[PDB]
Design a protein around this ligand. Structure first.
Ligand SMILES: [Mg+2]
Ligand SMILES: [Mg+2]
Lengths: 261, 261
């Protein structure tokens, strides 16, 4: 299976420009043969808000709203599955969400469980848990940005059968590119971290999107500042067999009753 | 306060030689100011057994047996606290254990929760959980070797207030030195991995003992092949403050209701 990140620079409060940009890069990933394409956190709205009001004003409902319907059209035209971060309006609340769409339409969503820094002023903590979406040819788990920091996020998706963890991100610390290969290794999964780039109202993002293997190899990694697509071929047998050798199966070896007490 | 690893080459089935070597190196760490000194997994017996008999016949009881006695003697003489891997005899059973002693006596033990590879032919899985020992001036968590692979091991110790995770290891895979700084970071704790070196019945150990900080810095890292000590100062306030910024306290931020389900 081929998987891809889109590393782009969202223009804050300019969703139509960001849709244009996303469509261009998703089409490039599709031409490269990607079947799953992951976009950054908050690709439609940007990130560095001064007030909750300027993001609430433009944030879209899922799946009725413009970001989801836009991505549905792109998935149908290119025949890929997309996981993309988006500001989700749900009544009077905002969630920091990721939408999953495929060529037949909307598949599901995930709401960021662990908010970072000023996101706590804008968004409600996610309340749908960590979900794994079965696409038939693969099962994709989704976590967003700072969720990487908690090993429990990736672990929960892997226990639920994720072959790949799709990871929209808007990184501001330099740690996640070092950590993602370890998250991939400790769960025996592939990870696709689609980070943004850019400077946005004085805040500089890290870039360095990457795809990591269950052997902690970096299969693709992006620049710090450029918009780009990265694609890697992945071997699903490697991640479905949780044996790391003939005497240790990492999930059968877990002894949950000793954890966190 | 200073903590240290001892990286040594246990001679299989020769505890007398291993005590002599350990004592030499513990004194070196103490001479450099270390207050806590961590030794490798199974430092007294070695590791690469072919029969359970050849280990069972020499394995010592805890705390009344010779390895604990030896460690108490050195701790008293050199004025340090020691965490050391040892084969533990308990009736007709062996555990792959670590002993914790200080200058005033035996403090406690830990039994490896996650057995690795052929250890399953020789040892019983541990049954005490992940323990944190309060030395008054600092709290020391213990895990052993392959426990590193499961993020839950280090997390359990850190949640119980470990300032430092003492980590006796006998590493054969290349991954742990890259992963330990991420274990230190994700728990905001210090880690001291005391690995062995050497070739033992054709099995080559990795060496690369290391001390990692709560900022994923590597404060000390040993060679691949040589016996050596490594000592570094640690900042207790850096581990005890779980805030990584004004809005994120990493333990307050955990949402266990969404983990593993
Ligand atoms: Mg700001
Ligand atoms: Mg006994």
């Amino acid at each position: 299976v081929k998987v891809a990140y889109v590393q782009m620079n969202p223009q804050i409060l300019e969703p139509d420009k960001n849709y244009s940009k996303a469509e261009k890069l998703i089409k490039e990933a599709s031409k490269q043969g990607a079947q799953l394409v992951v976009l950054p956190e908050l690709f439609d709205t940007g990130y560095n808000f001064e007030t909750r009001e300027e993001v609430f004003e433009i944030a879209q409902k899922i799946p009725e709203g413009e970001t989801t319907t836009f991505l549905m059209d792109v998935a149908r035209d290119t025949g890929v599955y997309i996981v993309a971060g988006t500001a989700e309006k749900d009544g009077d609340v905002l969630y920091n969400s990721a939408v999953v769409v495929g060529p037949r339409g909307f598949i599901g969503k995930y709401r960021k469980i662990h908010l970072f820094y000023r996101e706590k002023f804008f968004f409600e903590p996610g309340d749908l848990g960590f979900r794994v979406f079965d696409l038939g040819f693969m099962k994709v788990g989704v976590m967003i940005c700072f969720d990487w920091f908690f090993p429990e996020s990736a672990r929960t998706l892997a226990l639920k059968g994720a072959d790949v963890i799709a990871h929209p991100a808007n990184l501001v610390m330099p740690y996640a590119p070092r950590a993602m290969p370890i998250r991939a290794l400790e769960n025996k999964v592939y990870t696709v971290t689609a980070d943004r780039v850019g400077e946005e109202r004085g805040l500089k993002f890290i870039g360095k999107s990457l795809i990591a293997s269950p052997k902690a190899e970096v299969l693709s990694m992006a620049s710090e500042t450029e918009e780009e697509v990265g694609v890697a071929e992945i071997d699903l047998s490697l991640v479905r067999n949780k044996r790391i050798n003939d005497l240790n199966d990492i999930f059968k070896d877990r002894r949950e009753e000793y954890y966190f007490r």
